[PDB]
Amino acid sequence: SGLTDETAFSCCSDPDPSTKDFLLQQTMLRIKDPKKSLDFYTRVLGLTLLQKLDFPAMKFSLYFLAYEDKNDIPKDKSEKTAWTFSRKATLELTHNWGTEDDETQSYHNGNSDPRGFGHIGIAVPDVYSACKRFEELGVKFVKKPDDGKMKGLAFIQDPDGYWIEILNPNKI
Amino acid sequence: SGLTDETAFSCCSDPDPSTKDFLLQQTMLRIKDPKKSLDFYTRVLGLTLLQKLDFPAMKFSLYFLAYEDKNDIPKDKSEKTAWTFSRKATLELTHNWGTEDDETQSYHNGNSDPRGFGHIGIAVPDVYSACKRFEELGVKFVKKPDDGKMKGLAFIQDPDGYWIEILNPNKIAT
Numbered sequence A: 001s002g003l004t005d006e007t008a009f010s011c012c013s014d015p016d017p018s019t020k021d022f023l024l025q026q027t028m029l030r031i032k033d034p035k036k037s038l039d040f041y042t043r044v045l046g047l048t049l050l051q052k053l054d055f056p057a058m059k060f061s062l063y064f065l066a067y068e069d070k071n072d073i074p075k076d077k078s079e080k081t082a083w084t085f086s087r088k089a090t091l092e093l094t095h096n097w098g099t100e101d102d103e104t105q106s107y108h109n110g111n112s113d114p115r116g117f118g119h120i121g122i123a124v125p126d127v128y129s130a131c132k133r134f135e136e137l138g139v140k141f142v143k144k145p146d147d148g149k150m151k152g153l154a155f156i157q158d159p160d161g162y163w164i165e166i167l168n169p170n171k172i
Numbered sequence B: 001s002g003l004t005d006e007t008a009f010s011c012c013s014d015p016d017p018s019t020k021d022f023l024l025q026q027t028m029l030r031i032k033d034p035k036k037s038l039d040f041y042t043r044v045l046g047l048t049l050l051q052k053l054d055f056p057a058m059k060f061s062l063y064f065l066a067y068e069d070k071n072d073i074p075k076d077k078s079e080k081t082a083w084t085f086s087r088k089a090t091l092e093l094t095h096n097w098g099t100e101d102d103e104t105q106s107y108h109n110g111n112s113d114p115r116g117f118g119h120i121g122i123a124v125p126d127v128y129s130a131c132k133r134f135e136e137l138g139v140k141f142v143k144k145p146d147d148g149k150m151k152g153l154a155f156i157q158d159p160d161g162y163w164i165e166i167l168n169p170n171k172i173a174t
């Protein structure tokens, strides 16, 4: 069926004043092996590791990455934490300890049964130059820019197989 | 055991110059019913609908929401599109047509087998006041602020059952 524009925007309320300072701070993905994930997101995609949080009692770690200047990261732990969680658009990678050593274990990327989550997306100045570099670095592709239905956008995968869209906001 | 700081920090490369101006623009979630979802994300959570995209041949729509001023949205379609997709931290809701009419259909939130995706998280000035309003609005909870293992953060659910974390950066959990 699909919604008309008028129906859709009619379902949209103006923000309640109590929500005016809310910000979309994080997207969380579970990762099998942070050694592989951290290398991918920093070296291939150019994100910065803001903070590493460990929870020994609960046997997991959290890695928060974002497009931020590392020199802006506060050194003091408490000041670092308050800064990290106040950033927009961070990526939280969750490491349940031991998964990297378990050959039977893997996470699900949400694009096959059972579906839900789809992807994260990166805005880039140039999809084609970006994917050419990706190709040279051995990155695995779901969708090269000119394949599939929508031309000029790409899907690559991280070491867990999560889809990452590559897009140019000025060519859509 | 888990990685030492030293191992972890050693796996991090400085950004390649070619990655300059890269930004984390969107998180995409599939939604059963855009009527419920748009109402939830705008009225309950205070996000703004930036742009609606329809693809009739493939029978799906895309809804991009973000914490942005409605008045900053360009009126012209081409200018609107370039603006929407240049925003940081947008939420893309994907509606495959017909799902809302199929009582057997539902999406998986990634927090049960098979796990993967976990949640999106909203930073708020006050988790407790935010969750009190959520309760008052009939919002469904996974984890009220002082329940579960980490105190002072909450998980609520959207109409598809996706987890949304509620957190206060100036009042860290536990």
Ligand SMILES: C#Cc1cccc(N(O)C(=O)CC[C@H](NC(=O)CC[C@H](N)C(=O)O)C(=O)NCC(=O)O)c1
Pocket (backbone or CB within 6 Å): A118, A121, A143, A147, A148, A149, A150, A151, A152, A153, A165, A167, A168, A171, A172, B026, B028, B030, B053, B060, B062, B092, B094, B096
């Ligand atoms: C540039 C650009 C641009 C323009 C519009 C939308 C998007 N993004 O952010 C998409 O995710 C659309 C992706 C699209 N999304 C869908 O098709 C969603 C519907 C699908 N049935 C699903 O459930 O995933 C897809 O996966 N296409 C693959 C292709 O073209 O080969 C980007």
Ligand SMILES: C#Cc1cccc(N(O)C(=O)CC[C@H](NC(=O)CC[C@H](N)C(=O)O)C(=O)NCC(=O)O)c1
Pocket (backbone or CB within 6 Å): A026, A028, A030, A060, A062, A085, A092, A094, A096, B118, B121, B143, B147, B148, B149, B150, B151, B152, B153, B165, B167, B168, B169, B171, B172, B173
């Ligand atoms: C404020 C704040 C704050 C501080 C630290 C971390 C976080 N975030 O964003 C979390 O995701 C922690 C959530 C946590 N995440 C995990 O426990 C990660 C490991 C888990 N086994 C998994 O796979 O998700 C969880 O689900 N706990 C809920 C509860 O308290 O009962 C927020």
Ligand SMILES: [Zn+2]
Pocket (backbone or CB within 6 Å): A026, A028, A092, B119, B121, B165
């Ligand atoms: Zn989180």
Ligand SMILES: [Zn+2]
Pocket (backbone or CB within 6 Å): A119, A121, A165, B026, B028, B092
């Ligand atoms: Zn997308």
